[PDB]
Amino acid sequence: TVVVTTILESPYVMMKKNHEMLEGNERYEGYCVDLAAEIAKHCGFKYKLTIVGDGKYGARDADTKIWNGMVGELVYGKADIAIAPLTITLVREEVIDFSKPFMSLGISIMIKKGTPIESAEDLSKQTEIAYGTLDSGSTKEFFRRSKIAVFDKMWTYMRSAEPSVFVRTTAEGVARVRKSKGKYAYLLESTMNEYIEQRKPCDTMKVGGNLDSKGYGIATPKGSSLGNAVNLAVLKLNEQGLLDKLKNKWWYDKGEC
């Protein structure tokens, strides 16, 4: 039985309302739960869904050099495969293997409905509406390094802004938008932006195109015997239209706005 590590994140993996009366994999529902089933079916293996211990995605401590989250669970041998909204990055690709992207995304802008902002440019040219990002992560690093006037301009602003425009968690950014009465815009991964826009109280919306492009990939350890098959299954699923069908299902068909 293959040990799958994943993370409780909506709408990827969530516990059913009546989960206490259910067993094993049947306790969970979500985009990645359906995806795992598809992958396992096409690859031909039985599996067990396990929630990542520390509830993290995967980063290496610059001091201890220890990997946390799902990535850590793979390199230290606790799980055989990770099926989650795990962004494919250079540092992670150096210690584990990623299938080709099963979902595309990018940095996007979240505003409280009514806010007079339609793009990253609109934000850069004004200050009445504050805007920020997580105090760490690829989004912050993106602006921090962007040599693009519109983005670097936004960076200088964000850094010299008072009070701080940075938040520690995603939930904090989203709440700051909903409670700032239109005076705060939040930069985050488009997938989450699009998802929140379809959830009550339906008071936020995504605007403008994405600022960059990345993808989520299924991960397996170097040399894994699952690596190749998994990659081919992801491609097959996308080509059969299943990936788009699952996106629509969990984001819109189950939407509330």
Added chain:
Amino acid sequence: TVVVTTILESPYVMMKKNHEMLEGNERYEGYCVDLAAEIAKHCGFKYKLTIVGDGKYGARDADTKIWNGMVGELVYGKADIAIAPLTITLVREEVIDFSKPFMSLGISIMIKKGTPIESAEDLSKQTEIAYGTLDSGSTKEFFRRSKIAVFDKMWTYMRSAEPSVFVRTTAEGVARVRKSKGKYAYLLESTMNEYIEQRKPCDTMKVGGNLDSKGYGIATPKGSSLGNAVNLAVLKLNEQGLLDKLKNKWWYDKGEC
């Protein structure tokens, strides 16, 4: 010296106007020419850009089961790496290796400006404005195999439409749009649609969102000692913002509309 196989296609690889006075790699310019330079730099190797003999990207003959194009060059050991707008697909991934995608794309709709069509659904509900695709390839196949009502209806229309709505080449499809006075819409890869839209006579435009999602990747023979390194380089370049810089450079900065 690394032997790179590529193909002359705008704005990826093109012979400079004064190419006869230039030599080797210097004869060419474009997105893939710059990308090739960047990859080689980071990976630290010397290379030679060679143009695929048959002018094909990579398809397996159903009868002989022989691969043509750049895929063929890699599969049969004629080239070390392919740097071009080569779509990552299941059938290709089974015979060669692909780096993570360096560019995203999808099937899109090209219309001559003024055409009263905003989406694929719009096209599917009528026949006044004819629409088609290449007489062969993944776009045609996408429609042939789609389970989506709108797309399946579009397929049935295209297959039975007279005169034939299919074209032999990309240039023919675009030309047909431009000379049909808005009575012909062409379905093609978004990247080409967005490029042409920025080119005189500025009489075409992309409408609606893409119908699917895929990407171009750098390819190497299965088990190539270059594969790993090149893949890591692509991720690094995307993280450094170089891939977007190049896209903006060849599509928009050098724009004419």
